Design a protein around this ligand. Structure first.
Ligand SMILES: NC(=O)C1=CN([C@@H]2O[C@H](COP(=O)(O)OP(=O)(O)OC[C@H]3O[C@@H](n4cnc5c(N)ncnc54)[C@H](O)[C@@H]3O)[C@@H](O)[C@H]2O)C=CC1
Ligand SMILES: NC(=O)C1=CN([C@@H]2O[C@H](COP(=O)(O)OP(=O)(O)OC[C@H]3O[C@@H](n4cnc5c(N)ncnc54)[C@H](O)[C@@H]3O)[C@@H](O)[C@H]2O)C=CC1
Ligand SMILES: NC(=O)C1=CN([C@@H]2O[C@H](COP(=O)(O)OP(=O)(O)OC[C@H]3O[C@@H](n4cnc5c(N)ncnc54)[C@H](O)[C@@H]3O)[C@@H](O)[C@H]2O)C=CC1
Ligand SMILES: NC(=O)C1=CN([C@@H]2O[C@H](COP(=O)(O)OP(=O)(O)OC[C@H]3O[C@@H](n4cnc5c(N)ncnc54)[C@H](O)[C@@H]3O)[C@@H](O)[C@H]2O)C=CC1
Lengths: 406, 406, 406, 406
């Protein structure tokens, strides 16, 4: 309450109000909120005395910005992505970076369901025509989704949810994953990708962005899809050979597609968009909105705020993307924490401080990345003894930062 | 087998092959099939010795055509509609007309589900832009369907199926119907339309075409919808005031819409299409395809063929749209039938024929519209006695037609 | 209202109150109700001026009783069975007999579910012991129902409901039926009975009582069941060779059983019960209560009352067990009905009455069993003309009875 | 492989074979298996060189037995209970004790479902009579489960599963829990117990054994149940006032009950059983078999074996019932562990060993109960250096035990 009032939370780019509700319910009310992106100079001014900052995709938390933030304890990327933030620079200063990598699984699943529905029915095509005054009711090849085969690639958080929704619509779900998984409902793992592609009326992609998925769907892979099928991609902009796809649409080997993500995307609603696909009416083209809904924002705000709250209240760095992960249950005494370089001697030095005072260490957890180490410490002591100890902890060769959580 | 070979079935406009499978399985193989619309003179030539004709929307079974068909027993409209066929002229000659009014409930339901999904997510709009090179990711007002309220108007065959699919997607279903109905799953009847319209995020229409539904959704009704909601219409082209709708889209009172049907529709894929709505990207415009899928055609072919088969095998006119409805279970003896004008005296005359011969009438069913009457008759007799009886039946004052089913 | 007050309904053996609610809602309030079985002399006195009687299993509607009932139009067996009623004697006097053959499908299904649950767990056995002071927790061979195979014999009204409940419990359902059927959920028809019996952990019987099911489960059939399995019978008391069953329990080829029905059952709660099975604690023995619940009584009361109401209001004999079945939709004019012996000449005579008066017969339906015939007749006329006509109808050689429904 | 062959696993009282499959799949094959309970002297002989022992309810792991086990690393109670094992004595020697507290949730849920089914239908009662030659079909008060209200007390692992099964049967589920919980399906938390008891047709108990649940259902609580309802208890033998219950059965305030657990239970199938309830046929009495099925044994064997495997492979004491809980993810280097008395100085001493050698501690986790502490340690070193270090670790004042996992 009286200590907490003094911990400043800088929220920019308009994170969801639910984030500020969590913050207040946890006793943190010292919040500077902005709907808009702070510019370089107004950012440097606002972050200067900020304990935490939550941000989105437009803010550039850069080495200099981070290096100028003089009280900064942690960073919250209220989004999935994290590239606007310099993870190493935050690391070096003992600043863990949190985010929300699966707060939007429902949004993406629905989008796919809706897309394959209309695609199977030649609707994006007829609808482009109708707005042009041409009326082309072409029913010969339209189908109902029920009874048909969905091929999911990437049976992860989104894939599994997709498969469930697809079963409610009466489709048969099949998936390919580089690792083996336990199916839900009547899903079915398929061993080689060749079989999936062959038998699927609809193939949808839910994989991550790395070298194994780069151009994963290319001319060869596409021509294994069954004639007249559909390809949907709302995963990552690098997973599909757009020009191969364009060919297979022009040759009518595929009856249509939907793409929500591209190799390069406009930075802003006011930049021009370019794609070979723009020429096909039977293709649905969406500006990276797969995970973009009000519900997704509510989730993101709740999660990431919670993480910041937890790290502040008890030091947990579980799921931090730039730090070593550590969490310790609450039990009586005082908790302290200490970040430092990963060198022989530190842990002892740290512990020594307590032994030589005859203080009982109740629990301790320490984890360590290539160059850094972080460690939480519970101890049975007076506030007096803790403070003094903090000081001594700060002194230890290799110490980056330390703190007395309570 | 030997009698049946001689009963000709004229199929035009390419009805589904399943129709010809039913026909053959029932022992009828004398089929003249055409994928295309026969023209007036080639129609008059093909129908001339045809016992049955199945057709679709393009054929004009007109008084003259019907009057020239010299052996025509019944007509099968392999479609929902029936306006290409002159019902009275068929009636007058004792020709019942069958059709398929609910073979496509799934198709329409899916279309709606797919449409409200993408509509809720501003997808038709972003996708029109993307094809124009403009990239407008506008997520502030996009929602997931789950948790939201669907208002169904017309809880009939399609409505009930819609409500079920919508519940699987996790929506709350509410419906308004001029008559009271038993809800499925967790549906909920709403008493006045005002409440439905007020609370619904999505309103979809599944009513018939008559004077009570004509312009049913007009400026007043639309402005009772909740701000930012969606209106979908895949029922009949007369149910929505297109210009009121256009206003409510231009004023952003509604966030979007989908319309599959219009007051006047192009006769052909090669005619121009016109609507005030063509100017809104956030509106989905589809060329009457609600019920247009391969599955729907399979159903239609199965149903209507079955009806023709039944009427031919046992005289049932259940669901005939231009005749009085009659059906009688099979039990031993000979079945005969007789169509005639609805006048005093006929039934007696008909029965007299059997009494005076000392023949036992086992069963009989007679139904009667304003001017016509139809009656099936089972009797315990020899083929010899039946034939003679048929003759006498033909003689009866007011007789239109008669037949000895077996 | 004024005519209806005069139609007496005699209800004995305490049918459910819902029966009297239907009766009153339909405008019939002249009801003599008895919770108890009327005895021969008090029955003859109460039925004497009764238009309808509803009864249960204890009343003996016999030839004499029926022959003494001087105003009796129809009989309602508020039960499944009908053997206390002399069907032919009722027939001869043109009295249709209704009943309720599937008002209790849920009750029987639940009973089976509950029984196989406890049987699989050796519970009836441990529980007989516990009440005797012996404590025998014998878990080696107890199983959960989930994952196990239920074999249903008789995939009829009860079978299908059973299969559904069993799937909710996570069992695999298989069925054998002498006729081919469309499975629900994931049920599975099995061709020969041998396969069903072999693979089933639990076999339950839901077949009718006739010569094909008599002793259907006998020593040979039982020894095809898988070792340690269970047999449940709540169908008919003649379907299982009780002594074969007794052997297979004594040899531990079967781990247990439940039987709700027997070749001969005590007439009364005060008669002694005898069975070879009484000696096995691992057998559940229930006194024909499969369909005995308050809900079942509510259904029975609603159905059978409805039927009586329908027959009285519009003459329908649909599902009558002793009459020829006939039903006709309502359309303007006056309805009359006529029961008579199945002889040449009657129908004409009947129709003649209307022709010679120049009255238009709007509809007519006539059905005919081996010796009897029943026929409903709509006609366009004045009340005056109808009455006179009724009289003439009564006159017709072979006439048993006639009536002017409205 | 070569090290693992030398780690002896002593399994007694016939744990499930799946336990030995897990053991072998993990590379541990040195197993001494016994279907039977070893007696004191044959136990002391077999455990003498045993690294682990798995046991059930009959074995008395006592201070002396434990103190004589000279190589004993951990104990596996392949059961829920743990009272045959002296937890403190195991603790003092740094022996964690594992068990399986929720491997049988399905078994107990099914038992309840089956019991309330037959109870609602007066079946245990009619069935006791039938075996005595008396036939009492008493249907007036029998009900179907569907539509009825189940009151669950203890919405824990078993409660939640129960509620799900009950919903599939079409019941309405309500629960009371001393803590607040998130409902599944359409369950419903009820605030005071008074409301639950009042509205429930069936009340079933799934709470733990402690002072708050002792005699929780007593005369007052029972008389709040609705007249004619049922009480089921398969939780703990101390939760229900058996004599109050007996009164409420004798007064017909309750229509029946099922009890699987008692204040004192026979030690053996050959001991006599005593209860006031034995006198009521409408009560189901089962010898503590709620969780007793073959599936439950498979679960128990899998879990507990897994835990032993984990503790042996990586030191995890997660869910140990007598130890402080600690778990650490795998990452390169050597893992060691150390149990010791909870005194100032130890951790430093331990760490010192590595610093002064210039060895980098990669991770460390330490947890601490009232008198004991346990700590796992990863370190970057040679096997040589690890061994030497182990030795030094063993030397530390207060050290109880230490080990070099790999
Ligand atoms: N369109 C949009 O706005 C959004 C896109 N996404 C993206 O969707 C993707 C999936 O999302 P999540 O389910 O959260 O991912 P996840 O991590 O839960 O699942 C990824 C799955 O892919 C599998 N996998 C990895 N490489 C593979 C390969 N080469 N071939 C086959 N399977 C492979 C993994 O085993 C895992 O099951 C992510 O890339 C995420 O960034 C997420 C949210 C929104
Ligand atoms: N877009 C397309 O290609 C297709 C459109 N349709 C049309 O959809 C409509 C509904 O189809 P079905 O479910 O088969 O109809 P249905 O006859 O089964 O149900 C119509 C329902 O509307 C109710 N109703 C009638 N007038 C009403 C009013 N004034 N206000 C509220 N409720 C009213 C009726 O009580 C009934 O439940 C029909 O007009 C059908 O022609 C059908 C197939 C395809
Ligand atoms: N225990 C009790 O209190 C009650 C017993 N029942 C009895 O249960 C039986 C079934 O009830 P419902 O489902 O209403 O009957 P149902 O008539 O709906 O189904 C009977 C089924 O058995 C099949 N079948 C007939 N003979 C067969 C044979 N030889 N082998 C295999 N299948 C055969 C038929 O195809 C049909 O599907 C009836 O006998 C009924 O009287 C009904 C209510 C209560
Ligand atoms: N009959 C048998 O063979 C078996 C009996 N059991 C027993 O069943 C009981 C429940 O099992 P689980 O679901 O695993 O327990 P659980 O620990 O998962 O749930 C116990 C629940 O009771 C609630 N609770 C505790 N005290 C309460 C009180 N005073 N009033 C209302 N709620 C209270 C807790 O909040 C918790 O939700 C345990 O005692 C277990 O030992 C378990 C297996 C077999």
């Amino acid at each position: 309450s009286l200590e907490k009032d003094k911990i400043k939370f800088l929220l920019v780019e308009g994170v969801h109000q639910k984030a500020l509700e969590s913050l207040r319910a946890a006793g943190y009310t010292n919040i500077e909120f902005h709907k808009g992106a702070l510019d370089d100079e107004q950012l440097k001014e606002s972050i200067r005395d900020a304990h935490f900052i939550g941000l989105r995709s437009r803010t550039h938390l850069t080495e200099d910005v981070i290096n100028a933030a003089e009280k900064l304890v942690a960073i919250g990327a209220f989004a999935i992505g994290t590239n606007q933030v310099d993870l190493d620079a935050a690391a070096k200063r003992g600043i863990p970076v949190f985010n929300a990598p699966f707060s939007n699984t429902r949004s993406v699943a629905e989008l796919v369901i809706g897309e394959l529905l209309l695609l199977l029915r030649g609707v994006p095509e007829a609808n482009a025509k109708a707005h042009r005054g041409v009326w082309n009711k072409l029913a010969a090849g339209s189908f109902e989704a029920r009874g048909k085969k969905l091929g999911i690639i990437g049976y992860g958080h989104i894939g599994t949810q997709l498969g469930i929704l697809a079963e409610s619509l009466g489709m048969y779900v099949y998936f390919y994953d580089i690792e083996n998984k336990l199916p839900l409902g009547n899903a079915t793992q398929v061993q080689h990708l060749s079989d999936l592609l062959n038998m699927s009326d609809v193939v949808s992609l839910h994989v991550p962005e790395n070298p194994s998925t780069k151009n994963m769907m290319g001319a060869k892979e596409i021509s294994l899809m069954k004639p007249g099928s559909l390809l949907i991609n709302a995963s990552r902009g690098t997973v599909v050979d757009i020009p191969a796809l364009a060919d297979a649409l022009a040759s009518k080997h595929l009856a249509g597609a939907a793409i929500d993500v591209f190799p390069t995307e406009p930075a802003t609603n006011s930049d021009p968009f370019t794609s070979p696909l723009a020429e096909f009416d039977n293709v649905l083209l969406t500006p990276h909105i797969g995970g973009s809904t009000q519900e997704a924002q509510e989730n993101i705000g709740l999660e990431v705020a919670g993480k910041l709250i937890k790290y502040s209240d008890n030091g947990s760095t579980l799921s931090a993307v730039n730090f070593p992960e550590v969490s310790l249950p609450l039990h009586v005494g005082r908790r302290l924490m200490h970040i430092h370089e990963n060198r022989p001697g530190v842990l002892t030095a740290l512990n020594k401080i307590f032994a030589e005072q005859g203080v009982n260490i109740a629990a301790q957890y320490l984890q360590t990345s290539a160059q850094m180490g972080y460690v939480v410490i519970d101890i049975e002591a007076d506030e007096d003894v803790a403070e003094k100890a903090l000081q001594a902890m700060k002194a230890i060769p290799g110490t980056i930062r330390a703190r007395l959580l309570y």
